[PDB]
């Protein structure tokens, strides 16, 4: 799809058998979700956003469906005021910005 | 232009006679710059953000050139780890996300 930016670019995701929404975020290097259970091993990571800092769990090689497209990559779990799909996974969709 | 997202989508901006770079950020509702003097009146705002809160100055009807395109809108000034161009101004460029 093509979408314009008059509203937030929110898409449906499926991860670990649960359905959520997330914002396609070209300003985010990494994908960060809050409201989700992932199984298995993970590593502590701190990420830095406008408001300071947030401490996250890094899950590697996570299967995720984004607007219908299956991909695998890194997902960070931690407090974020909005679930975010970052460029790590947008590149897998061949996403572009156009103007 | 069309750009891909393997690298951060950074563009050149000109504002208030000052040249800067900024990230094109579809996850940001508003444009937020740190490293910049604007003249005139402004209002306090809190914007929220991944690691919490930031206190910003809101400047209205600010002339800004983004990748060569002249627009006017709202610019927030305050601490941000990265200058970001939000949807308030990308809609003025007719920007779209495509996949
Ligand atoms: C500030 C950016 C360089 C970085 N961020 C992405 C950014 O798109 C966030 C993404 C975002 C979105 C909603 C809430 C928190 C963070 N948007 C944001 O801070 O925008 C603010 C300015 O406009 C307002 O509208 C949204 C909040 C305000 S971030 O959230 O800090 C971030 C940083 C690193 C990663 N991996 C993922 C996210």
Author numbering:
A (entry chain A), B (entry chain B): 1 to 99
Q: Could you share sentences copied from the article?
A:
Protease (PR) is essential for the maturation of human immunodeficiency virus (HIV) and is a major drug target for treatment of the HIV/AIDS pandemic.
In PRS17/DRV complex, however, L10I mutation does not alter the conformation of Arg8 and the ion pair between Arg8/8′ and Asp29′/29 is intact for both the subunits as seen for wild type PR. The new conformation of Asp35 in PRS17/DRV is anchored by formation of an ion pair with the Arg side chain of K20R.
